Amino acid sequence: EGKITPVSVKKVDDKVTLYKTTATADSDKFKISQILTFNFIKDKSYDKDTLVLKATGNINSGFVKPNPNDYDFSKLYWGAKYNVSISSQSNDSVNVVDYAPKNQNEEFQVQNTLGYTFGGDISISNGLTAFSETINYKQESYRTTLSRNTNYKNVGWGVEAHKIMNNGWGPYGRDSFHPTYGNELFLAGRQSSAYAGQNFIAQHQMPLLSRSNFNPEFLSVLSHRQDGAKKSKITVTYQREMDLYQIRWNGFYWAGANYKNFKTRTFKSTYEIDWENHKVKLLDTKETENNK
């Protein structure tokens, strides 16, 4: 649910003209917000039309705190992985050619610059030309990877829990497991004389992405061959994988268990890109849930 701004035009040289329009689609229910800025680059010195899409917005973590009254067993849900996907769903003249980030990255702050040079050259550099854009996001304790299904018409990224320190313990991940204590990701004490509901570390000691939200900044470059249809379809998906983290007292010690992607919340928008008129039109939005 949202709006699409009118198109703004910026004539660079006599060769290049930039056109921009921003679309916003939201899921109030899942607390996901997609802000999509389509930058069309018309370059007379290049035999292809270029589109630089910047995807920003918000994806809530889906965090659910534990019931403090839980005595011997308790659980909480946390935002373990954020997935953003872009797909060219029609028109064989259109392909996904470049993107940022373009490689795995576990730095606390991801910063990249994408530049377009007169003549068609796309360059991506680390840190913050006829056109330029940047991506900047914080992902402390998490790691960004390029989705396995990335190909000539598809690009995706995953921002997943990676190296999470408890106090000085760790690092722990979605898969860590101690032969005795299980996954200790958010376990406060192995022998705590406490209610289970009160034996997790505090929210402020957990990564911001795990208990708050993720503010994505991703860039995808689509190329149009200048032959065939002027319009094409594109889908943009924002998703969170929520893990069920639970702790239990067995009479002797505390042990933890993390169920990976136990709950999934997904928001997908479908737009029709009009490469001739530098506009986009919302065709559909779809909210989908998975609950194991």
Ligand SMILES: C[N+](C)(C)CCOP(=O)(O)O
């Ligand atoms: C914090 N931890 C539960 C992951 C490791 C053990 O801590 P502790 O029970 O020795 O205080």
